[PDB]
Amino acid sequence: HMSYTWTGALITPCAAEESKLPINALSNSLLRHHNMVYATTSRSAGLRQKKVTFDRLQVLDDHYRDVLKEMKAKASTVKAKLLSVEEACKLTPPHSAKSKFGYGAKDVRNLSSKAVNHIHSVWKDLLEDTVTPIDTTIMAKNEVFCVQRKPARLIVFPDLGVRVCEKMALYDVVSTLPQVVMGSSYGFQYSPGQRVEFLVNTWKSKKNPMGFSYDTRCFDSTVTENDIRVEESIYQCCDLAPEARQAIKSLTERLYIGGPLTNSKGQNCGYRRCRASGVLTTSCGNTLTCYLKASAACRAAKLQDCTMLVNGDDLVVICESAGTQEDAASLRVFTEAMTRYSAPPGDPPQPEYDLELITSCSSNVSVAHDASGKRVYYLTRDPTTPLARAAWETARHTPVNSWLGNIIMYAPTLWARMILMTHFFSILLAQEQLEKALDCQIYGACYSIEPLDLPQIIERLHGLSAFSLHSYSPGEINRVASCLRKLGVPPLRVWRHRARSVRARLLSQGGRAATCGKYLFNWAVKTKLKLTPIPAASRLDLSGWFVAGYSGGDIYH
C-alpha cells in the first residue's frame, strides 16, 4: 500500500528553469531583498519524492460507513449530463500541455480534425477497455515563494485527449455534486465575502464557539485505492447516461486509482497508487474524501454542534466549546480518528477562541470600517506570497498572473489596494497595456480578464464598500508592515504617495481607465469622488465564477 513506487529515473524539466528572482528596472520599486524570493525547480524533485512516498493503513468504522451512506443518499438526487466533444474542447486552457499524439491546446480549442478525431478515439477506447492503466506524466512545478526553501510540488497528469475525455464524462458531476452532497460546508460555492459571512454567522451560532483548522500531511499521498473507489461509488449515485457511467468506471479503474509515471524524456519513473494531482476529479475527490473522513472523525470525537467548511484538502471546523481542557482532548480524538482514516496531521490542530486567528484556505477574517463608520468583516491573508509572486511577475511574463487573481480575491484588503493595484496599474499605464486581457486563476479554473474591468468585477463580487474600507485592525496593519520589512518593500506612506500619481494618470486616460482611477484609488485622495453603482457591473456574466473547485483540472472558463 505504498503511495509511490520509483524506478530511479529522474523527474526531468521541459525547458530551462530559473530559481533566482529575475531582476529588471522595475524590481527595486517593489522589493529590495531579492534573495528572499525563489522558485522551486526539478532540482529539488527528489526531496519531494521522499516526502510523498509512504505506506498507508486505513481502519474504517461505523461512523465512516454512516456518513458515506448519507452522502450517497444526497448524491442520488444529482442529475448530470454528458458534454459534447466541442463543449469539452472549449474548456481547455490555451497553455495546457500538448498531446503526445501530434496536437496541442490551440488545436483542441480550434476544434481541429486531428485533435477532435483523436479525442473520439480515446473516448471509444474508454468505453471498450475498463482495465488498462493509462499513461501519465510526472513533473516538478515551478512555483514562487519567500524564504521561511520548500521542495517543488509534483504534478501528475494524463494526455490532452484523456483530459478532454474527463471533461466529457465528469465536468457536470464535479461542478454539481459536491454542493448537493455537502450543502453549506462546500467551500468553493462562496465568493470571499460569502465565505466570511458563512464563518461569521457560524461562529455567532454557538453559545461558546471554538474553531480549528486541520492540516493533513501531504493529502494527495494519503488518498487510498479505497478512497478512490468510494468516490466513484458516490459519482455513480447520480442519474447519468449509460456512456457516462461506463466512461467514469473506466477512468476510475484506468486512471484515478493509480498508474505508471513517465518523465518528460519518456522514461518510466515509477508507479502511483494515490491521488493524481492533475486530473479533473482532483478538487472534487479531495473535498468529498476530506469531508467524509472529517465528518466521521467529528462523530468519533463527539464534537458538539460542529459545522465544517471544506475546500479540497483544506478543512476548518467550528463547534461548541466544552472548556479549554476538554477541547484539547476532543481534538486529540479527532486527530486519532483522521489518522486511522489515513489523513494524519501535519501540524496538530489547536483549538481557537478568536475567529480572526483561524487560518483556512490561507486566509482569515478581519475587521475594517466602511464609509458610514460601521465595522465590516472581510477576507484577508498574509501578503508574503502574493508579493513574492508579484515581484516575479514584475520582471517576467507568466501563463497565470497571480497579482490579478489576488486583486480580485483580496480587493477589500489594505495590501491588495495600496501595493498590488498601485504597482500593477503603474506598470500597465507605462506600457499602454491597460486594454490587454490577462489570464489568472480562481479556485483552480483559468479566466481571461481585462484589467480595465476591475472596478465592475470588484463591485459585483465584493460590493461598493470594497472601494471605501478604512481603519484596518492594528493586527492586520502590523502583519502587512512586518511583511514589508521582511521583503524590503517600501512602507505604505510611499504607496499612498504613488497611488495619487497612478490615480491622476488613469483619470487622464478617460473611459474605463478613468473608472479604475475613480473607484480603485479613491482611498488615496482627501478630496473623494462619489462612487455610484457601475452600469456595466450588472451586465457582467459572472456565472461559473464561484461554483466549484478545479485545481489540477485543466479548466478554462
Q: Using CB under 6 A, list all residues that contact ligand SX3.
A: 414, 417-418, 470, 472, 477, 492-493, 496, 523
Of 517, 317, 334, whose CA–CA distance to 434 is shortest? Answer: 517
Binding partner at 30 among ligand SX3, Ni ion, none, C-beta below 5 to 8 Å by kind: none
Q: Is 229:252 a contact under the CB 8 Å cutoff? A: yes
Task: Pick what 493 binds: ligand SX3, Ni ion, none; C-beta below 5 to 8 Å, kind-dependent.
Answer: ligand SX3
What's the Cα-to-Cα distance from 430 to each of 423, 425, 505, 506, 510, rounded to whole Å?
11, 9, 10, 11, 15
Q: How many CB atoms lie within 10 A of CB 357?
A: 12
CA–CA separation, 34 and 185 (whole Å): 40
> Closer to ligand SX3 at the Cβ: 180 or 464?
464
Q: Choose one: 5-13, 59-67, 109-117, 503-511; the region binding Ni ion (CB under 5 A).
A: 59-67
Check if the beta carbon of residue 423 is closer than 8 Å to that of residue 481: no
User: Would you say 212 and 352 are in contact if contact means Cβ atoms under 8 Å apart?
Assistant: yes
Which residue lies nearer to Ni ion by CB, 66 or 354?
Answer: 66
Nearer to ligand SX3 by Cβ, of 119 and 414: the residue is: 414
Close Cβ partners of 171 (under 8 Å, ≥ 6 residues apart): 83, 88, 91, 280
Shortest Å distance, C-beta 491 to ligand SX3: 7
Residues 6+ apart with CB under 8 A from 16: none
Q: How far is the CB of 296 from Ni ion (least distance, A)?
A: 10
Q: Which is nearer to Ni ion, 66 or 450 (CB)?
A: 66
**Least CB distance to Ni ion at residue 62 (A):** 5
Task: Kindly tell me which of 493 and 539 has the beta carbon lying closer to ligand SX3.
Answer: 493
Residue 521: CB minimum distance to ligand SX3, A: 9
20 or 470: whose CB is closer to ligand SX3? 470
The angle that helices 492-507 and 511-520 make with each other, rounded to 10 degrees, is 150
CA distance linking residue 335 with residue 185, whole number of Å: 20
Smaller CB separation from ligand SX3, 350 or 478: 478
**Residue in this structure with the C-alpha cell 498508474, named with its chain if needed:** 259
**Using the rule CB under 5 A, is 62 a contact of Ni ion?**
yes
Tell me, by CB under 5 A, how many residues bind Ni ion.
2
Please answer whether residues 145 and 267 qualify as being in contact, where contact means their C-beta atoms are separated by less than 8 angstroms. no
Residue 322 binding: pick among ligand SX3, Ni ion, none (C-beta 5-8 Å cut-off by kind): none
Name the CA radius of gyration of the chain, rounded.
Answer: 24
Smallest gap from Cβ 65 to Ni ion, in A, equals: 8
The nearer residue to Ni ion, 224 or 413, going by C-beta atoms, is: 224
Give the CB-nearest residue to ligand SX3. 417
Least separation in angstroms between CB 427 and ligand SX3: 19
Residue 221 in 3-state DSSP? helix
What minimum distance in Å lies between the beta carbon of 481 and ligand SX3? 8
Q: Is 314 annotated as a binding residue?
A: yes
Q: Whole-angstrom Cα distance, residue 215 to residue 147? A: 20
Q: Which of ligand SX3, Ni ion, none lies near 79, with the C-beta cut-off 5 to 8 A by kind?
A: none
Considering only the stretches 52-60, 66-74, 132-140, 549-557, report the one whose residues sit in contact with Ni ion under the rule CB under 5 A: 66-74
Question: Which entry of ligand SX3, Ni ion, none binds 397, CB below 5 to 8 A by partner kind?
Answer: none
**Which residue has cell 524590503?**
488
**66, 129, 432, 435: residue in contact with Ni ion (rule CB under 5 A):** 66
Residue 419 CB, nearest approach to Ni ion (Å): 52
Chain-centroid distance of CA 347 in Å reads 21
The entry of Ni ion, ligand SX3, none that residue 305 binds, CB within 5 to 8 Å by partner kind: none
Q: Give the H/E segment covering residue 210.
A: strand 209-214
Residue 414 interacts with, from Ni ion, ligand SX3, none (CB under 5-8 Å by kind): ligand SX3
Residues 166 and 169: their CA atoms lie apart, in Å, by 5
* All residues at 6 or more sequence positions from 369 whose CB lies less than 8 Å from its CB, including other chains: 375, 376, 469, 470, 471
d(CA 36, CA 27): 13
Could you tell which of ligand SX3, Ni ion, none binds residue 435, using a CB distance below 5 to 8 A set by kind? none
Question: Is there a binding annotation on residue 215?
Answer: yes
| Cβ proximity to ligand SX3, 492 vs 540, nearer residue | 492
Residue placing its CB nearer to Ni ion in the complex, 273 or 498: 273
Cα distances (angstroms) measured from residue 520 to each of 316, 367, 373, 459: 32, 20, 19, 10
User: Whole-number minimum distance, CB 419 to ligand SX3, in Å?
Assistant: 9
Q: Rounded CA gap, 142 and 137, in Å?
A: 15
**159 annotated as ligand-binding:** no
Q: What distance in Å separates the CA atoms of residue 348 and residue 356, rounded to the nearest whole number?
A: 19
Q: Which does 523 bind (CB under 5 to 8 A by kind): ligand SX3, Ni ion, none?
A: ligand SX3
Residue 62 interacts with which of Ni ion, ligand SX3, none, CB < 5 to 8 Å by class: Ni ion
The least CB distance from residue 366 to ligand SX3, in Å, is 13
Residue numbers in the known binding site are 215, 313-314
Residue numbers in the known binding site for Mg(2+) are 215, 313-314
Residues of the shown chain interacting with Ni ion in the complex, contacts defined by CB under 5 A: 62, 66
